[PDB]
Scaffold this active site. Structure first.
Site, PDB file in Angstrom:
ATOM      1  N   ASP A  62      13.363  -7.749   1.055  1.00 14.69           N
ATOM      2  CA  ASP A  62      13.785  -6.683   0.159  1.00 14.69           C
ATOM      3  C   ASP A  62      15.256  -6.372   0.457  1.00 14.69           C
ATOM      4  O   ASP A  62      15.550  -5.578   1.356  1.00 14.69           O
ATOM      5  CB  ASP A  62      12.903  -5.444   0.352  1.00 14.69           C
ATOM      6  CG  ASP A  62      13.232  -4.322  -0.635  1.00 14.69           C
ATOM      7  OD1 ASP A  62      14.330  -4.351  -1.234  1.00 14.69           O
ATOM      8  OD2 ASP A  62      12.392  -3.408  -0.793  1.00 14.69           O
TER       9      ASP A  62
ATOM     10  N   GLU B  49      11.966   3.091   9.818  1.00 17.02           N
ATOM     11  CA  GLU B  49      11.596   3.031   8.413  1.00 17.02           C
ATOM     12  C   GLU B  49      10.193   3.590   8.251  1.00 17.02           C
ATOM     13  O   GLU B  49       9.235   2.838   8.141  1.00 17.02           O
ATOM     14  CB  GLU B  49      11.666   1.595   7.888  1.00 17.02           C
ATOM     15  CG  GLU B  49      11.401   1.475   6.386  1.00 17.02           C
ATOM     16  CD  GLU B  49      11.313   0.020   5.925  1.00 17.02           C
ATOM     17  OE1 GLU B  49      10.346  -0.678   6.301  1.00 17.02           O
ATOM     18  OE2 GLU B  49      12.211  -0.427   5.188  1.00 17.02           O
TER      19      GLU B  49
ATOM     20  N   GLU C  82       0.598   5.976   5.047  1.00 17.78           N
ATOM     21  CA  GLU C  82       0.627   5.437   6.431  1.00 17.78           C
ATOM     22  C   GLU C  82       0.831   6.522   7.498  1.00 17.78           C
ATOM     23  O   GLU C  82       0.554   6.287   8.678  1.00 17.78           O
ATOM     24  CB  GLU C  82       1.698   4.352   6.604  1.00 17.78           C
ATOM     25  CG  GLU C  82       1.480   3.136   5.683  1.00 17.78           C
ATOM     26  CD  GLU C  82       2.402   1.959   6.013  1.00 17.78           C
ATOM     27  OE1 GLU C  82       2.772   1.755   7.192  1.00 17.78           O
ATOM     28  OE2 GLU C  82       2.772   1.236   5.077  1.00 17.78           O
TER      29      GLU C  82
ATOM     30  N   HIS D  57      10.503  -2.883  -2.785  1.00 12.46           N
ATOM     31  CA  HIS D  57       9.110  -3.239  -2.546  1.00 12.46           C
ATOM     32  C   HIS D  57       8.213  -1.998  -2.576  1.00 12.46           C
ATOM     33  O   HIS D  57       6.991  -2.118  -2.490  1.00 12.46           O
ATOM     34  CB  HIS D  57       8.971  -4.006  -1.218  1.00 12.46           C
ATOM     35  CG  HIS D  57       9.079  -3.154   0.013  1.00 12.46           C
ATOM     36  ND1 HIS D  57      10.285  -2.861   0.616  1.00 12.46           N
ATOM     37  CD2 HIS D  57       8.127  -2.560   0.775  1.00 12.46           C
ATOM     38  CE1 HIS D  57      10.073  -2.112   1.685  1.00 12.46           C
ATOM     39  NE2 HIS D  57       8.771  -1.915   1.803  1.00 12.46           N
TER      40      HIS D  57
END
Ligand SMILES: NC(=[NH2+])NC/C=C/[C@H]1O[C@@H](n2cnc3c(N)ncnc32)[C@H](O)[C@@H]1O
Ligand SMILES: NC(=[NH2+])NC/C=C/[C@H]1O[C@@H](n2cnc3c(N)ncnc32)[C@H](O)[C@@H]1O
Ligand SMILES: NC(=[NH2+])NC/C=C/[C@H]1O[C@@H](n2cnc3c(N)ncnc32)[C@H](O)[C@@H]1O
Ligand SMILES: NC(=[NH2+])NC/C=C/[C@H]1O[C@@H](n2cnc3c(N)ncnc32)[C@H](O)[C@@H]1O
Lengths: 342, 342, 343, 343
Positions: B32, B124, B133, B281
């Site tokens: 990406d 990230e 997540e 993405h």
């Protein structure tokens, strides 16, 4: 329980969570080959069900139990471990069959069933037939089967055949070679290229293919569900000797399967072969680490060894040799995590 | 007992870290270019925030952000990673001769020990819809290692919400659910489950991109300041909204995307996943209403998006919206854990 | 206490004949050139069936068919018409100098009194799906005036039906009903009526044309012989069907069209509303299943189309379709009286 | 009853069958101007509803009753003569309002209410305001209204103005000239041309138009629902003097209407004027048989007389002359059967 002892909890949770979805039931039901063939095997063998006691193993939404009812079963015990058992109960009620179908929530290795049955029905097949290890649950349920009982499906045949697919083989390296550059944003990634290659090669490829890539007639390995014990599925050694019909490079083995319903009136086949209409099982291909050249008329001999693991799947060990040349290759794959290429 | 394990089902953790052990996934993220190129720019353009500083990289994966920190002149970088990728990261550290500056610490950031406090944290942590997540909590948790006047890259996260019209998408998901309306599927009445099917099918956030002209109002912005926010602030996230409708029509749901800013000493660098920007993405996310709402231009659409963190490393999402002038109201529930990639 | 009034609600009849009193409606019918041109061909090419004969024109409207019969040489034509259009017919008879041959007799064919028996009956008794308007029963009723050796134009009627696939049509009707799923329309929960709405929207036969490629099997034919049939035969019309599916896919319903044949002494002339023929003002008619059926090529689709006549001059349609190999079954009730004009 | 005495059975049966369709309810509800303005009128005047007794005349699916409930009404009697009353009852139940909304199936002229009410709500407006003659039912319901009572809508204003539309006018002859031909398949149709012209001109034209075709400021005729009696609506005489703002040919009169909800907090307006967003009422135009030439500054004077008929509508008589020239034209139109021209 037998299930608990052979399955990692983490695997079991995700597995049954997956089957709790109506969308997965729809995907299975919308496979006309699968649903229509099951229906046909049951109804055209109506004398195997009429006024019988039936055990449905892993019934999901209950479809096979309804088919058994259509054929005239007296009582059907429908066992399902996922939360889909709730929805099956709704359908039993809404279809006015509560007097004939009883839904038992839980694993078939763990539930208490009161009586012996005349026939067991199930759809236990996964990818390559054996993935998910549900065939063991199906065979385990035979503790409830009368000695003169029957099994629908009655047998399963796994088929193996060598294939050539230069583009599939090269694709692995095209992807892995991402890692082979000295300055990805200033970073030399090249030390991981070998690891990436290995990782791609450990994954069975789930998709379909033109039958013209097949280089020999398949070798068949038959499980007779009426005879087998569940222990017979923990280690499956499939020897093969292929008589090459074509000359070329063999890049791996292709897998598919058939099951047969052997009833009193007739035998019905369900096939996932590449020569047949596509199913939600597709087919499976396992690459060799290196291709093998074989002339037409040569023999490609070896074994495929399937070793069951606690993740409800198998490790696939493949060794192959061209007898006339001695050229040899192999691979060791993880069936739990296939690559969906289709 | 640790902060991570107390908020996380073991089953979920196992599969999560297994997934991030795959090099193919590291490749997908690295390829990406918007993502990777923007991170490098944020760090190199703000090289003074790294020059001879102590750095912590939370969830470093194969380590690419550590390498950027190293290029920018960091004296020492602690690179924390809980998956088996940590060993692949160490291989790259060695092959890039950066053993003197990057130190991989295998394990969860909630559990490992560091020798010293750091000047800046990099990570990230953004998942789908930013929050999926639950990595942002690990990111915030790592602030226990941050010196009093330390910095964070990214520094802030902006969540954007806006209503959209897309009758095609809505009826796509309706067409799927209608399967369970069938009163005689192979002789079986499925209609009793129709309600359950729609609920399930509309719980899926829709991941894909779209034309900005489907938006019916200017977006509302909800900002998370990572310097200020505490871990507990992300357990229950209530995002109020009031849209001033610019076009009349059916509102089929809310679209979501996010921006993060790296507020460094030299400059502020933005990473945006907005539908006006180059596709990443992360794409964009849309949450459908079970029933569209009609609004005329000049009307106001008000309500709340409520995110409750769950033990599966995700959020249960509750969206309630009403047209203020009419009292027309819609309310849907979504399982952010399991989206529909379109 | 005529046969007409016995089978017909007064409210229906009043509106029916008011509709057909409009010249604009006569223009619509006359401007269908396939229709008007085929009728003229059937009559003129079979002129020997009319020459010096006595004719009854049932439901003559502005009189066009009676003029064709006069062109073919008929000695006497009785033109019966129950709407106010009878008066306009009379005006045309006089302005065309045919007062010695065409006799307008106003009233219902079940109620008027004719001066004599006729050699041949002519009419356009076909509505949408052939049977709408229940005019075929008036046509057959009129046979009380027909000589034993007499003929009827049209002589027979063929109903065709075939399964079709059309996801866009199916989706259009569900998009409409979705309105009544709303849990808060202006703060009102409508959803309790969602079932009733779906039923109502799917009760509408769809009138329009379509590409013949949506048809998934060869049509089945149901033939009505007007020389032989009796009025009572049209109160209950049961059309059994068995299709051999030629394509795989979802069947969303049955498509309907009809042909009529004029079987004269010189030649048989066919008027077709089939989708393989030039469009007429009859178009074609599709009845949707509430839930589509899947079938593969080679399977058989069997069932019945049942039409029960009602007192609003139409039929209550019930269609049941079943895939024989799987027992997948679908049904619908349709109100032929009130179709959805989609064209 | 008062209803059955002024309405032909045949007309009534069709009328209430029509309003039995959920599709028709959906059509009215989806007119956002209509539904939204009613909700606004009621909710922003909550003091005219809070803890009050309400009658909803012709409630259909019941939407207005739910708005009255949202505004805090103690009790709502919702009266509906079509089968749609069964669906309203379902909605009241599923919305948990059985304690506050009583559905009473039947004609408002025939049912019995258990008590008097503080306010009547309805949507009685048809095309050109008066079509359907439901305003009479609305006024009739005032036998149940307390002497303080209010009416929502409170007043209705019909507007009319002269228009020029050369193409609309010429359209009528283009259509009627179908009949002006001497050999349509051998038949001379020309004798019916005049009848065809007359028939087209008797139809009011329902569609919308650019406001620039209007040639003068509208004249307004007001019905005050608080004061009007049923009988006042049997003969409606609307005199007009138009002061022409533009020079040109006047081809007819254009009609639209407004209603006002005159509450204690504020007055809310619902308008169907061509200057406002389009509603399902559109606007209505009635052509003159011959156009009238007027110069800017000239006066166009005459009368629009509406005469109620037993088909739940009006015969329309319009006579107009240009005062400065004596040039005169008229027309007789049938409001029950308008031409829907909108595209
Ligand atoms: N495609 C497929 N047919 N996959 C296999 C089919 C699996 C189906 O059987 C159920 N199942 C699996 N193992 C089970 C057990 N031990 N006891 C009860 N139900 C069980 C799953 O929840 C699913 O509904
Ligand atoms: N799209 C994305 N960037 N997703 C988030 C990225 C998460 C990355 O950080 C790792 N990670 C997640 N939670 C962690 C924790 N508590 N401690 C240490 N490493 C952790 C994951 O294994 C993955 O490599
Ligand atoms: N489109 C069509 N061809 N529709 C069918 C044709 C209907 C025509 O026949 C007339 N008609 C119908 N039933 C009648 C009866 N019982 N006696 C006399 N005239 C009758 C109608 O008024 C219309 O002019
Ligand atoms: N678009 C519109 N606003 N159309 C007018 C609205 C008419 C509504 O009022 C009902 N209605 C008409 N006359 C009635 C009566 N005498 N008693 C009870 N209900 C009656 C109709 O069935 C329809 O639901």
């Amino acid at each position: 329980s037998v299930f608990s002892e052979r399955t990692e909890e983490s695997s079991a949770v995700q597995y049954f969570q997956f089957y709790g979805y109506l969308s997965q039931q729809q995907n299975m039901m919308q496979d006309y080959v699968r649903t229509g063939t099951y229906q046909r095997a049951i109804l055209q063998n109506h004398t195997d069900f009429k006024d019988k006691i039936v055990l449905d193993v892993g019934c999901g939404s209950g479809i096979l139990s309804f088919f058994a009812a259509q054929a005239g079963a007296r009582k059907i015990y429908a066992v399902e471990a996922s939360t889909m058992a709730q929805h099956a109960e709704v359908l039993v009620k809404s279809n006015n069959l509560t007097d004939r179908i009883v839904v038992i929530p839980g694993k078939v290795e763990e539930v208490s069933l009161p009586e012996q049955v005349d026939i067991i029905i199930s759809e236990p097949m996964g990818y390559m037939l054996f993935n998910e290890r549900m065939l063991e649950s199906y065979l385990h349920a035979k503790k409830y089967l009368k000695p003169s009982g029957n099994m629908f499906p009655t047998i399963g045949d796994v088929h193996l055949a060598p294939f050539t697919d230069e583009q599939l083989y090269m694709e692995q390296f095209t992807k892995a070679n991402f890692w082979y550059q000295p300055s990805f944003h200033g970073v030399d990634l090249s030390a991981l290229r070998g690891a990436a290659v290995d990782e791609y090669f450990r994954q069975p490829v789930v998709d379909t293919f033109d039958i013209r890539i097949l280089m020999a007639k398949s070798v068949k390995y038959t499980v007779n569900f009426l005879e087998a014990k569940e222990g017979d599925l923990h280690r499956i050694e499939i020897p093969f000797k292929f008589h090459m019909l074509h000359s070329g490079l063999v890049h791996g083995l292709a897998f598919w399967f058939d099951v047969a319903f052997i009833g009193s009136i007739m035998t019905v086949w369900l096939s996932t072969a590449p020569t047949e209409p596509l199913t939600h099982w597709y087919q499976v291909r396992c690459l060799f680490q290196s291709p093998l050249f074989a002339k037409a008329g040569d023999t490609l001999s070896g074994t495929c060894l399937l070793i069951a693991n606690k993740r409800q799947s198998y490790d696939i060990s493949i060794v192959a040799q061209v007898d006339q040349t001695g050229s040899k290759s192999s691979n060791l794959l993880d069936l739990k995590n296939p690559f969906f290429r289709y």
